[PDB]
Amino acid sequence: SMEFQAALSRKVAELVHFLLLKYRAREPVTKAEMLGSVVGNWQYFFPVIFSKASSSLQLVFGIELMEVDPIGHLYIFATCLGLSYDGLLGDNQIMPKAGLLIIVLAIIAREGDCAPEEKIWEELSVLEVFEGREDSILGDPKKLLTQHFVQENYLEYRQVPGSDPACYEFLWGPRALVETSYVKVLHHMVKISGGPHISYPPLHEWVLR
Amino acid sequence: SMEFQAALSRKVAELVHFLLLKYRAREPVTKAEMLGSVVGNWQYFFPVIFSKASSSLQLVFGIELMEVDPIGHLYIFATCLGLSYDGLLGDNQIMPKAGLLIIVLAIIAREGDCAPEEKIWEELSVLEVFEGREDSILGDPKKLLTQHFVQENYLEYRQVPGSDPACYEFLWGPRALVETSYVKVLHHMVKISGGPHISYPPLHEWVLR
């Protein structure tokens, strides 16, 4: 189970890397090409592998794999919510950033007009992508990442008006307001997570015994 | 020696942290305040400690400590070359970025109009500030840092014209050209490193024996 699941997950990660390379080249991709990457044995597991990889693309990277030919199984890529930014730099092997941008936008939209930076830090600190490197000499990578988002005008960062000592908050920047909307971001979050839960357990009913 | 130098360097790092806090608050600082941070014993070593800390500020962080009152020993701060950017974010404990920005600008100015990104990566990879975290899932921190500099318009990043497959290069952005100049950056580099060296050894003279 644990070994077999490790090997299966390795195949998933290989397909994710292959699809990311296709995305960088702005090349379409077929099921047949993907089976030309799922080497040997694991052909039988293509439905699950594919289904995981696609999911990863949406959730981690903010990239949507879209079937344009159901018969030939031809796929193209789009950035989630149509954003004009994916955080890439030429052909350098760095991670697309649109998923994390959308997560931050969603936290802000959940809170209202703005969100204290502490809420952003708390929410981002639970994501495994930061792999315990908060203590980097250069600076906490999640905060430098939000700096990326502020410099691209998707976010605005400002002092909370009238705070002493100074406190700071994030709002949607002009580019975020032009390219998307509160309803589209919140809908995307509800869609790609599945309907949420955390329902309270039966501590709301009385046994009347 | 090694222990004593470790303790002395720890005092240097404490003074660097204190001066960085003063810089964030845009507060002036006196020698007397600094001795109120060099706790106890190490008062006698204030000349060397100070001299190291100040040097660090220039070389690592791109911050110049400037004496405005020789009698009272009052100091203020400036960003090196007068840049309007230091890479900070509110009161978050992240490292000022102006020194690394100036290093990149200097590599470009050394090469001419532009520099291939590979030269930038090679030169940045020798700096200990990146502490062997090139393999971060989020992306290589030195490349994300250059992304900071491109998004602030200090750098421009573009494909090398006519390259196949695509190669990429860095040039000075409009903000860098407005705020400083090639001569000022190259002079700053010559100044803060001391006059360079790496002179060839006596493999250029003939012993004529």
CB contact under 8 A, A147 and B87: yes
Three-class secondary structure of residue A30 per DSSP: strand
Backbone angles phi, psi at A133, to 5 degrees: -110, 30
Give the resolution to one decimal, in Å: 2.2
The experimental technique behind this entry is X-ray
Q: Which of B60, B121, B137 to mutate to test the interface with A (most CBs of A within 10 A)?
A: B137
Distance CA B186, CA B154 (A): 16
With an 8 Å Cβ cutoff, is A25 touching chain B? Answer: no
**DSSP secondary structure letters along A71-108:** TTTEEEEEEGGG-S-----TT------HHHHHHHHHHH
- Chain A nearest-CA residue for B169: A90
Say whether B143 and A89 touch across the interface (CB within 8 A): yes
Please choose, from the candidates A34, A36, A47, A65, the residue with its C-alpha nearest in 3D space to the C-alpha of residue A8. A47
CB atoms within 10 A of CB A99: 23
What are the structural domains, with CATH classification, of chain A? 2-82 (1.10.10.1200), 98-192 (1.10.10.1210)
d(CA A118, CA A163): 15
**Distance of alpha carbon B37 from alpha carbon B26, whole angstroms:** 18
Is A197 strand, coil or helix? coil
Identify the three-state secondary structure at position B45: helix
At A149, the amino acid letter reads F
Query: Which candidate from A92, A136, A166 shows the least CB-CB separation from B91?
Result: A166
Q: At a CB cut-off of 8 Å and minimum separation 6, what does A156 contact?
A: A150, A170, A171, A172, A173, A174
**B178 CB within 8 Å of a chain A CB:** no
Q: Distance (Å, rounded) from C-alpha B117 to C-alpha B124?
A: 11
Question: Within a 10 A sphere around the Cβ of B42, how many other Cβ atoms?
Answer: 18
Farthest-apart Cα atoms in chain A, separation:
69
Q: DSSP label at B57? A: I
Question: Do residues B26 and B66 touch, judged by C-beta distance below 8 A?
Answer: no
Task: Report the distance separating Cα A189 and Cα A181, nearest Å.
Answer: 12
> In Å, how far is A87's CA from the nearest CA of chain B?
9
What single-letter DSSP state applies at residue A205?
A: S
As beta bridge partners, residue A171 has A114, A156
